[PDB]
Each structure stands twice: as structure tokens, then as C-alpha cells.
Write a protein that binds this ligand. Structure first.
Ligand SMILES: N[C@@H](CCC(=O)O)C(=O)O
Ligand SMILES: N[C@@H](CCC(=O)O)C(=O)O
Lengths: 500, 49
């Protein structure tokens, strides 16, 4: 099960065409939908006269099944060269990307990822040849804490998925929330990706015990959120109502299927993306008859239309079928075009006067990759930072349930600073108050009390007063916090006093 | 392959350990004396005599 096309210079791809489901079921939105985008980009590049004249590109596309070990064991085909691979364009999960980068760096094959958002990959000591078209998962935590503090939420529960992405994201979120101030994690939970009442139902039944925390921040995978929602619906319509999800939830309508009322009013974040109209025409025209290139495509059809009853030779992929372009279909084109531009610059420099091609050096090719900027194929300039990342711009969506239909609509933005519109928002309950106790203020000389780390008494500190010298009410009207021993005036019998 | 008996050079041992740790194969070098391999964060399955 693979796609092999031959050309002067060819590239590799890694996509999660199969998912665990509820390699069990095809990933309609983040599988086939991205293979077709990569093939469309390759076809568009080949016909362009300006770029790679006399060089025809090819593809080596494989399946990861959303597993790091499986992708690692099938990425050995890239190094054993069989077909020689100039660069690898496919990586969709941080766990897959890290393991693939570890093997590829040894054999000096450049890699570009279109959907992996993990700060660990920002390290260039251990990942020399890794490049990225999306921002690292460090601005996303800042955006989530900004959303949490803007609406006054200080008592929240956090859930994460075991792995690089979930753990790194939840650690960054906790650090930024502590730095922001007043955001306190009542419960922090982790999920191991095994759907079982032992863990997932226990997570939902352990979030129940803290009723004051009515908001949940989650760093969980695409498949883990589905089990979270299913367990939430089973267990008395959930006890963790508000869900502030990261890009893994994104705006995917598939996970919330049959569990819609659970996610009513949730707020989710995605990378800022603009639709590509050119790919819309390409995808719809891909019939079962004509699209023989994709080996998996037939199976996708059986899932998409629930057909084999005999199929009617009139069904198509259109607005009725909810074509619904995936969010990260613009970064695949950017990655493929960046690699093509780097190869074009390399071959223009090395052998002037000959458009055609012998041996490619990974190090200098990667040096070319880090030093190329260009306007996007149709939407926006593409460039790499010093570490190979992309700038952080995020959009905010909310799972509103209109009477007619349930959908995500944009509710704001975040580029180093947060814009939001509360008026159009709709809530599950009525803002979801998530607080424990009133914050301490220098009201009658300040205080700070122990208890549950999320709770504080904030009583008075009776007596004298000073300006900023309040250290747990420490003495030098004593105030129990006397620091007026510094600025104290000495009074003596004045000359002009009447007693004098 | 239960285990791999090392290498006689530090560069060879490092390059072999990098590939072997991914597939979880223990390694025991008999003649590599570099102190870069003393790190256990990047060389999990490497040991030396
Ligand atoms: N950024 C996510 C995946 C994003 C996606 O697949 O949509 C991760 O690191 O796993
Ligand atoms: N310890 C030496 C090798 C000594 C030997 O092989 O005799 C090295 O790291 O290269």
C-alpha cells in the first residue's frame, strides 16, 4: 500500500491515512485529504515552466496509522536507496515527526513538517535537518491563558494526552498560567490513548468531584478527544462542561459526531489559514474511475457515502457532501513549494547553462532551505525562522449550535495580542464562572492564608499602615505588620505652643 | 539480535548507538573511552566496559 512515481528528483510523504476509530478506519479529513493536496502541488509544480525546467518530480507516499513505531519502521525505505529521496515532506504528529527525524538525520535527508507543533522539535542540537511550516506550540499556550484570564477564569481543570505534544503543551500552559497570575489547576489528568472505562471514565468521574472548576483546558490528540467526548456523553452528559481545546481539536466536526450537545459552546484554537480555491476544483473532480493513483481512495469512497447497496454512478464530492477543506491544507503546498524552490536554487547555482541534472548533499541543501523566502503559491509569503519554525497567528472558533445546524465560526484572533468578540458567543449554560475564592487585596492591610492551594481566606491585618511593606504581616496600632518604624515623626514641646 | 557487542572507536559507537536506541537493542562497547557517551539522555541503551 504505497504510491510510487518516478522522476529525476522525488520526495517522500508521511500521512495518517488510517486511524484507530471508535489502522481501523480511514482518516477522511487528515488522511486522503492531504495526500490529494500533495499530489496536486506536485502536478502544479511539474507543469510550471519557471520552476524545475527539465526536472519532473515524483512522490513516495506512505501511511503512519498515527503511530510513531509504525512510521519509524516504514521510514526505513527512505534511507535504503529502491528510489532515491531528495527530501521528506510528510509529518503530521509530533511523536511521528521526532522518530522520523531521528532516523533521517543520520543519513542526512532534509525533512519538512506541515502540521507538527511541538517545542521539542525547535531544538537544533538533536534535530539538524528538521524544518517546519507551522509555529511551535509555545504561542498557543499564551493564547489559551490570555483567553482564560480575559474572561476571568481562575479555577480550571487540565487534561492532557501522554506523549510529546500533550505533555509539552500542558507544561507550557501551566507555566504561562502561573506567570499570568491567579490561574490555578484544580486537577491535572493524563490519558494513555487506550479506550477503557478504567481510565477515560475514571478521568471524567474524577473531574466531577471538583464542581467549582467548570472550565477544562485540554492538550489532547485528535483521536483522544473523541474518546473524551464519548465518555463524557456516557457519564451523565459530562461533568467537565467547558472545553478549551487546542489545534488537535481544531474545527474538526468529525470527533463531535453523535455527541454534539456535549461540546455546545466550546472554544477552540487553530493556526491562521486562508482557503485555497485551486485545490477545491481538483478534489471534487477526483472520481473513483479517474483517480487510480491513490490506492486507498476506493475505501475512502465506501466510508464517505456509505456505499459499496450498489453505488449509483452519479454521486460526487460537493457542498452536499460537506467537502469542508481541512485547516492545514495550505502548509502542505507551502512545504512542497519550499522544497522545490530550494532544489531549483541548488541546481541553478551548481550547474549554470544546463537545466537538467548527480549527487545531492543534504547539509548544503538544508542551508539552501533555511535561506529561501518567497510569496506563497496563492495566499501569503513563506519563510523560515532561525530554528525553522513559522510565525504564530491563531484564530478562535466556537462550536455554536444554531437551530438549523451546528458549526464553528471565527470569534477572534491572536497575533502576540488577543482580539475577541463576546457578543456573538454562545455558552453551554451565562458565562461559566470558574473561581474559588476572592483574591487578596490590600484591604485593611492585606493578608495571605493557607488551605487548598486554589483557596485563600484573605482576612484583614488590623492596625497601623504603610505603603508596600506587607510580608505576611511582620512586625518591626502595631498592625501586626509594623513597618512604620522607618517613617515615624518625633514630637516635642514646640516653642509657640500655648502650654509653652 | 539480543544485543550488539560494541565497537572499537568512539565515532562508530556513537553512530551505532543512535540507530540502535530507536529499535531498543542494548549495546556494550569494549574499547570506546569517549566521555560524550556518558550522557544517558541521548544514549539510553549504551554501556561500556
Ligand atoms: N500539532 C499536532 C497535530 C496537528 C494535526 O494533526 O492537525 C501534533 O503535534 O500532534
Ligand atoms: N578508546 C579509543 C579506542 C582505543 C582502541 O580501539 O584501542 C577511541 O575511543 O577511539
Amino acid at each position: 500500500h504505497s504510491i510510487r512515481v518516478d522522476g529525476d528528483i522525488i520526495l517522500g510523504g508521511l500521512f495518517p491515512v488510517h486511524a484507530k476509530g471508535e489502522c481501523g478506519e480511514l482518516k477522511k479529513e487528515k488522511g486522503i485529504h492531504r495526500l490529494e493536496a500533495m499530489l496536486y502541488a506536485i502536478d502544479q509544480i511539474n507543469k510550471d515552466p519557471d520552476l524545475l525546467s527539465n526536472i519532473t518530480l515524483g512522490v513516495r507516499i506512505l501511511d503512519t496509522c498515527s503511530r510513531d513505531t509504525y512510521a519509524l519502521e516504514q521510514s526505513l525505505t527512505f534511507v535504503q536507496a529502491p528510489d532515491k529521496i531528495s527530501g521528506v515532506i510528510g509529518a503530521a504528529a509530533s511523536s511521528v515527526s521526532i522518530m522520523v527525524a531521528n532516523i533521517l538525520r543520520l543519513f542526512k535527508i532534509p525533512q519538512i513538517s506541515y502540521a507538527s507543533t511541538a517545542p521539542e522539535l525547535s531544538d537544533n542540537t538533536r534535530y539538524d535537518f528538521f524544518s517546519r511550516v507551522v509555529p511551535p506550540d509555545s504561542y498557543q499556550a499564551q493564547a489559551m491563558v490570555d483567553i482564560v484570564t480575559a474572561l476571568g477564569w481562575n479555577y480550571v481543570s487540565t487534561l492532557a494526552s501522554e506523549g510529546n505534544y500533550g505533555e509539552s503543551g500542558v507544561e507550557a500552559f501551566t507555566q504561562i498560567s502561573r506567570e499570568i497570575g491567579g490561574v490555578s489547576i484544580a486537577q491535572s489528568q493524563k490519558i494513555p490513548r487506550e479506550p477503557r472505562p478504567g481510565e477515560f471514565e475514571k478521568i471524567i468521574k474524577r473531574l466531577l468531584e471538583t464542581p467549582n472548576a467548570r472550565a477544562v483546558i485540554m492538550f489532547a490528540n485528535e483521536d483522544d478527544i473523541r474518546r473524551i467526548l464519548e465518555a463524557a456523553k456516557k457519564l451523565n452528559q459530562s461533568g467537565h462542561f467547558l472545553w478549551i481545546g487546542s489545534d488537535s481539536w481544531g474545527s474538526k466536526i468529525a470527533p463531535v459526531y453523535q455527541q454534539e450537545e456535549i461540546a455546545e459552546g466550546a472554544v477552540t484554537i487553530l493556526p491562521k489559514r486562508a482557503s485555497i480555491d485551486g485545490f477545491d476544483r481538483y478534489f471534487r473532480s477526483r472520481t473513483l474511475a479517474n483517480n487510480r493513483r491513490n490506492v486507498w481512495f476506493a475505501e475512502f469512497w465506501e466510508e464517505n457515502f456509505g456505499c459499496k447497496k450498489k453505488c449509483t454512478g452519479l454521486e460526487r464530492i460537493a457542498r452536499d457532501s460537506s467537502y469542508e477543506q481541512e485547516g492545514k491544507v495550505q502548509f502542505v503546498i507551502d512545504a512542497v513549494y519550499s522544497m522545490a524552490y530550494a532544489l531549483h536554487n541548488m541546481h541553478k547555482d551548481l550547474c549554470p547553462g544546463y537545466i537538467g541534472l548527480s549527487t545531492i548533499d543534504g547539509k548544503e541543501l538544508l542551508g539552501y532551505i533555511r535561506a529561501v523566502n518567497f510569496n506563497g503559491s496563492a495566499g501569503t509569503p513563506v519563510t523560515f525562522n532561525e530554528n525553522g519554525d513559522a510565525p504564530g497567528r491563531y484564530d478562535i472558533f466556537q462550536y455554536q449550535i444554531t437551530n438549523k445546524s451546528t458549526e464553528y465560526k471565527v470569534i477572534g484572533h491572536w497575533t502576540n495580542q488577543l482580539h475577541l468578540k463576546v457578543e456573538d458567543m454562545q455558552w453551554a449554560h451565562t458565562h461559566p464562572a470558574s473561581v474559588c475564592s476572592l483574591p487578596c487585596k490590600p484591604g485593611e492591610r492585606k493578608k495571605t492564608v493557607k488551605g487548598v492551594p486554589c483557596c485563600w481566606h484573605c482576612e484583614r491585618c488590623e492596625g497601623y499602615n504603610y505603603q508596600v511593606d506587607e510580608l505576611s504581616c511582620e512586625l518591626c496600632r502595631p498592625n501586626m505588620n509594623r513597618t512604620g518604624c522607618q517613617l515615624i515623626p518625633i514630637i516635642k514641646l514646640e516653642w509657640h505652643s500655648p502650654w509653652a
